[PDB]
Design a protein around this motif. Structure first.
Motif, PDB file in Angstrom:
ATOM      1  N   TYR A  37      45.456  18.152 -41.866  1.00 30.92           N
ATOM      2  CA  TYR A  37      46.864  17.984 -42.192  1.00 30.92           C
ATOM      3  C   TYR A  37      47.049  17.672 -43.682  1.00 30.92           C
ATOM      4  O   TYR A  37      48.044  18.105 -44.298  1.00 30.92           O
TER       5      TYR A  37
ATOM      6  N   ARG B 140      49.716  25.288 -51.721  1.00 32.04           N
ATOM      7  CA  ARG B 140      50.337  25.060 -53.017  1.00 32.04           C
ATOM      8  C   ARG B 140      49.514  25.619 -54.169  1.00 32.04           C
ATOM      9  O   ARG B 140      49.975  25.571 -55.312  1.00 32.04           O
TER      10      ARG B 140
ATOM     11  N   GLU C 240      55.298  23.266 -39.743  1.00 31.72           N
ATOM     12  CA  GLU C 240      55.569  22.565 -41.012  1.00 31.72           C
ATOM     13  C   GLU C 240      55.159  23.390 -42.235  1.00 31.72           C
ATOM     14  O   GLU C 240      55.862  23.334 -43.251  1.00 31.72           O
TER      15      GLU C 240
ATOM     16  N   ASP D 192      57.947  25.656 -42.667  1.00 20.62           N
ATOM     17  CA  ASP D 192      59.117  24.903 -43.119  1.00 20.62           C
ATOM     18  C   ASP D 192      59.065  24.520 -44.587  1.00 20.62           C
ATOM     19  O   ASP D 192      60.115  24.235 -45.175  1.00 20.62           O
TER      20      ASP D 192
ATOM     21  N   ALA E  46      58.153  26.443 -47.061  1.00 22.29           N
ATOM     22  CA  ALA E  46      58.478  27.579 -47.916  1.00 22.29           C
ATOM     23  C   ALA E  46      57.558  27.638 -49.131  1.00 22.29           C
ATOM     24  O   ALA E  46      58.014  27.693 -50.277  1.00 22.29           O
TER      25      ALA E  46
ATOM     26  N   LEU F  70      64.242  19.933 -47.343  1.00 19.69           N
ATOM     27  CA  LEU F  70      63.464  20.373 -46.190  1.00 19.69           C
ATOM     28  C   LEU F  70      64.311  21.231 -45.270  1.00 19.69           C
ATOM     29  O   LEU F  70      63.845  22.246 -44.781  1.00 19.69           O
TER      30      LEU F  70
ATOM     31  N   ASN G 246      64.384  24.590 -47.108  1.00 21.42           N
ATOM     32  CA  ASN G 246      63.130  25.322 -46.994  1.00 21.42           C
ATOM     33  C   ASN G 246      62.900  25.817 -45.561  1.00 21.42           C
ATOM     34  O   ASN G 246      62.363  26.924 -45.366  1.00 21.42           O
TER      35      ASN G 246
ATOM     36  N   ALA H 131      56.065  15.446 -42.047  1.00 22.84           N
ATOM     37  CA  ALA H 131      55.527  14.688 -43.178  1.00 22.84           C
ATOM     38  C   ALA H 131      54.964  15.623 -44.250  1.00 22.84           C
ATOM     39  O   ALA H 131      55.388  15.558 -45.408  1.00 22.84           O
ATOM     40  N   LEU H 132      54.068  16.536 -43.872  1.00 20.29           N
ATOM     41  CA  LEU H 132      53.554  17.508 -44.822  1.00 20.29           C
ATOM     42  C   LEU H 132      54.727  18.250 -45.477  1.00 20.29           C
ATOM     43  O   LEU H 132      54.790  18.409 -46.708  1.00 20.29           O
ATOM     44  N   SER H 133      55.660  18.740 -44.642  1.00 20.83           N
ATOM     45  CA  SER H 133      56.760  19.534 -45.166  1.00 20.83           C
ATOM     46  C   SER H 133      57.840  18.676 -45.819  1.00 20.83           C
ATOM     47  O   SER H 133      58.521  19.149 -46.733  1.00 20.83           O
TER      48      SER H 133
ATOM     49  N   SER I 227      56.312  17.907 -49.281  1.00 24.60           N
ATOM     50  CA  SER I 227      56.332  19.081 -50.144  1.00 24.60           C
ATOM     51  C   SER I 227      57.754  19.367 -50.615  1.00 24.60           C
ATOM     52  O   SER I 227      57.977  19.741 -51.773  1.00 24.60           O
ATOM     53  N   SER I 228      58.736  19.222 -49.710  1.00 31.10           N
ATOM     54  CA  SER I 228      60.115  19.508 -50.093  1.00 31.10           C
ATOM     55  C   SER I 228      60.659  18.458 -51.046  1.00 31.10           C
ATOM     56  O   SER I 228      61.509  18.772 -51.873  1.00 31.10           O
TER      57      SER I 228
ATOM     58  N   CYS J 127      58.800  17.043 -53.335  1.00 29.13           N
ATOM     59  CA  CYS J 127      58.272  17.545 -54.615  1.00 29.13           C
ATOM     60  C   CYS J 127      59.147  18.656 -55.173  1.00 29.13           C
ATOM     61  O   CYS J 127      59.457  18.670 -56.368  1.00 29.13           O
ATOM     62  N   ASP J 128      59.531  19.624 -54.321  1.00 30.25           N
ATOM     63  CA  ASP J 128      60.376  20.718 -54.801  1.00 30.25           C
ATOM     64  C   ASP J 128      61.708  20.179 -55.326  1.00 30.25           C
ATOM     65  O   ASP J 128      62.222  20.664 -56.356  1.00 30.25           O
TER      66      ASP J 128
ATOM     67  N   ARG K 258      61.054  18.447 -58.678  1.00 36.46           N
ATOM     68  CA  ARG K 258      60.577  19.400 -59.687  1.00 36.46           C
ATOM     69  C   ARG K 258      61.722  20.278 -60.181  1.00 36.46           C
ATOM     70  O   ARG K 258      61.897  20.485 -61.389  1.00 36.46           O
TER      71      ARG K 258
END
Ligand code: NAD
Ligand code: NAD
Lengths: 332, 331
Positions: free
Chosen positions: A19, A27, A57, A60, A62, B158, B161, B243-245, B248-249, B251-252, B255
């Motif tokens: 995970y 990335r 995920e 999700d 993108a 999120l 995305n 959590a992962l997404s 990441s979102s 961060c987007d 950024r």
């Protein structure tokens, strides 16, 4: 920006390290910001729902570099066509256990998946075994996949290596970006030798040896070594799970340096198939200092080995032989 | 540049924090050439785990990372930070009523507003992730009146995305080819995921999503339901929320806010409403925005049809209901 994607397998993908690792791959941290990737994620049937959740995920998020996600419990499907295989599938140890203590549960995974990779992965696939016991799982994989080029199978000691870098950075209060060229010799276990004899720190007055700046050989030869050896157990004590963020990041570093090459003047630690260098028996998966270029590792030859280092290198080689023999006893 | 940017992550010992701090340390949030210092804030019950996160950040030997502060003291955590990502909170668990989730979370944002306003760096950019995201951010803004109103936002990226991902999957095209969906309103099941201004790159040029999908029934029905219910789908699959997404979102979101949105692209951000689009002023509400020079700007004048208008108004009303519930928790 490449048009052709690289297919990257992560086994154990529904677990803690998986995970942490899959978004880093998506990335661009493993193969570069200009390299599209397709992920193959492999787990086992009890985790099928969670595995699909990880895929949901990834979709999700993108991720623009990500060009496909296969999420499966079928090893043939997971291994087909892959160019990089990061093998994390297996049980983690609990607080109080040794890394060897998951051998009985995990080595059968590596015997089985060796055949799937050998028959179905892309010909030049690079394999990195993370799951513990890392060196011995990789050796079992190599022995059950004899047609995979020996140079293409490795195991992860880069977290031990990065831990050693981090300890030097903290001790000296310098940025870790300035520290390089520690070496982890041997097994990913308490027999590893974290060696600073060849390590350097960049300073305002040039590169300096670590020992010259630490001014405490006793610490470097004692508590530093045991701190690095025992760091995984310390993480489990703090978090109640073993070191997923840092294992994932270190697996990215291992593959990235292997494929894109090490920087000039830097070497890194990789568990690789021993060839007789440094008077270590050939035919083990054993961590050495290496540089990488053109997609291949090369052991850093010519380093001076003192008698203390020699003894530690031989003890860890002997432990690896013992673990290999016990692993075979755990297999049908 | 040279000098590091100081980034606060609150809730840093939790699931999203654990996924997010290595992304920051890797340069995913502020750029591959931008050194960072992390401040991580959690609460005393999580102190041992939080120390473990710091130990792993050190163990990863991240070259861009120039320091890690791990603390349970909100003032220490907020001192001198240039970006604050607020993840601290309590996710809804079975048996928690809507008022229970509101009360446990909005009190954090009332409290931490004072520490941020008094101790963060001038022009600190704030992103609230913890749910209820829009209402937590509104409470933070109201209790931190000296923070410029355009510097407080919440995470709908999120949701955004997720909508890009659904279009990518429906057409079976790479998500890099899809852009310019819009999430209007609340980070909740009342959000409006709008594709009327979205495009897909094809071999014969950029085309509107509606023209390519040729399935208005799906875009106006199950597509919207799928995005609205996706967080619940993740919980059903993993037994934990995203959590992962989410990391990441986040961060987007930061950024694009700090470094600017890409050419031709707009993104969704929950920001302090000013009356644009006939949405009530003074809410935290998700709008399509572009970003430059560190500031967001709403994309104005997009045509709003009758069906879209009703959805935009319903989510505003839900935000007003959440605000009233938050207020009732704060006395
Ligand atoms: N530096 C290192 O080399 C290092 C560091 C930390 C942890 N580890 C080891 O990495 C491994 C994973 O740790 P984790 O915390 O992610 O554990 P985890 O239990 O969270 O994840 C392991 C996952 O492996 C999957 N699995 C089991 N059998 C499999 C099979 N035949 N094929 C594919 N997947 C399978 C499990 O279902 C699980 O989802 C452990 O063995 C751990 O000790 C290695
Ligand atoms: N898109 C989004 O906006 C989005 C997506 C997913 C989850 N969420 C929400 O994000 C939040 C975190 O989710 P998670 O899965 O990481 O939960 P988690 O419970 O694993 O992490 C939350 C952490 O916040 C910490 N916390 C509580 N009070 C705090 C305080 N006063 N100061 C600092 N830290 C504090 C907790 O101790 C915990 O470690 C939840 O509110 C969740 O519902 C939002």
């Amino acid at each position: 920006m490449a048009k052709e994607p690289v297919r990257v397998l992560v086994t154990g993908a529904a677990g803690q390290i998986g995970y942490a690792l899959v978004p880093m791959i998506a990335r661009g941290i493993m193969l570069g910001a200009d390299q599209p990737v397709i992920l193959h994620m492999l787990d086992i049937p009890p985790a099928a729902e969670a595995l699909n959740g990880v895929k949901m995920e990834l979709i999700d998020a993108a991720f623009p570099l990500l060009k496909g996600v296969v999420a499966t419990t079928d090893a043939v499907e997971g291994c087909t066509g892959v160019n990089v295989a990061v093998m994390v599938g297996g049980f983690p140890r609990k607080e109080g256990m040794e890394r060897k203590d998951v051998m009985s549960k995990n080595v059968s995974i590596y015997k089985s998946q060796a055949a799937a990779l050998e028959k179905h992965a892309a010909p030049n696939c690079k394999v990195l075994v993370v799951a513990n016991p890392a060196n011995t799982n990789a050796l079992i994989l190599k022995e059950f996949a004899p047609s995979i080029p020996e140079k293409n199978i490795s195991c992860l000691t880069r977290l031990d290596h990065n831990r050693a870098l981090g300890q030097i950075s903290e001790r000296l209060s310098v940025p870790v970006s300035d520290v390089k060229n520690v070496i982890i010799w041997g097994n990913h276990s308490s027999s590893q030798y974290p060696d600073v004899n060849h390590a350097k720190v960049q300073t305002s007055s040039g590169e300096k040896p670590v020992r010259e700046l630490v001014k405490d050989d006793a610490w470097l030869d004692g508590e530093f070594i045991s701190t690095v050896q025992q760091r995984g157990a310390a993480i489990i004590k703090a978090r109640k799970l073993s070191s997923a963020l840092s294992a994932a990041s270190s697996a990215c570093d291992h593959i990235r340096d292997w494929v894109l090459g090490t920087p000039e003047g830097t070497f890194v630690s990789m568990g690789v198939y021993s060839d007789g260098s440094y008077s270590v028996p050939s035919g083990l998966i054993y961590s050495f200092p290496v540089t990488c270029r053109n997609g291949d590792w090369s052991i850093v030859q010519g380093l001076p080995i003192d008698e203390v280092s020699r003894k530690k290198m031989d003890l860890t080689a002997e432990e690896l032989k013992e673990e290999k023999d016990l692993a075979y006893s755990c297999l049908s």
